[PDB]
Amino acid sequence: DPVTGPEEVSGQEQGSLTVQCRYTSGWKDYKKYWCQGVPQRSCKTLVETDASEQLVKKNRVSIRDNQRDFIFTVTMEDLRMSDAGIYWCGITKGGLDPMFKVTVNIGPV
């Protein structure tokens, strides 16, 4: 399968959480992103790379693509209680993107 992640991930309010989305070698030079919401393919993209290993942070979310181990790491900072819900590990391509569903749970400190 093109991209795999954790089925569920949990964090605490005002804290952080980390999600690791592993992918197969062929997808190295593609853009990776972190999506939020349903329907799946109309979700809001929170942050996206430029197909480099450079760290990119938008919408409280940062992403870094490790193109040696073929894993891009997503971190969500300053978590709110409203951040819980459906998210996706994504790989940008023409047509239907490879995507993986990740469930996010948030709790107090």
Partner: protein, 300 residues
Amino acid sequence: RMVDLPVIQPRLCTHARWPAPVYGLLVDPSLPSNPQWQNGRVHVDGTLLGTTPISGSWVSCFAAEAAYKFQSGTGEVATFTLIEQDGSAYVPGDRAAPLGYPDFSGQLEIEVQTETTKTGDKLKVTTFEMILGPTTNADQAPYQGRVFASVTAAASLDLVDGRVRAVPRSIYGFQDTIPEYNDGLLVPLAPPIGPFLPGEVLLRFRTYMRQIDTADAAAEAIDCALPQEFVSWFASNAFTVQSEALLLRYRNTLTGQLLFECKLYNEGYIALSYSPLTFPTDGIFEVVSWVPRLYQLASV
């Protein structure tokens, strides 16, 4: 010939934006006042606007040459090369998409005839999932004649490529905004419905779509400006326009009671003077005369 209207009650009509009967007739000032619907748009002189088709069986449907490939993690993926629903070639022109293509947003379940190579099966009906809009990561371009759909499957469904007709099974996360017609770029569109004089509101013919909803049981409403019978009526009659709008009366066919007076603007929408109010659906629309665009109506 002076313009006339079909003697059909609204409750017996076909909706113009989703293939279902008309169930409701109403005005609602709390809704968007100038919707940019692309289906159910006709000029009183017979000109079809937007992607509006003649037949109700084209509404929210499409036709295509389908090519199937299995992609692990996604399932069976369909690439639909769109064609006009009668088989004639679709050419990008002054419309947003092939005639009858959906003009709303959300996740659409569609049904197509598929042929399989698996022993013991040949012809089956497969449900596909197709994102419409408002913005997608699927790069839908019905304006350019290509859209993508998929079926979640652990292994290939072993389908044969061929021609298909796709009909809508359900809507998920419905939103009344135009879909992604051109991978985020803009396309030729029928203009927003309007304008209205002060106090005039759009008359809405309402149906309810088959829906997928994980939390809410309320019905999913969708409005159109004119029933499909009115669209083909004007398209076939090709009346001559003699003024700016037509004054209509909506009356009970049994009792004779006038329920309201309204104005049918030449551009294909009906306005009433109102300060949500639903109406009986067993009345008949009757043309009274041509009137100026500035004609003030009696309020309902």
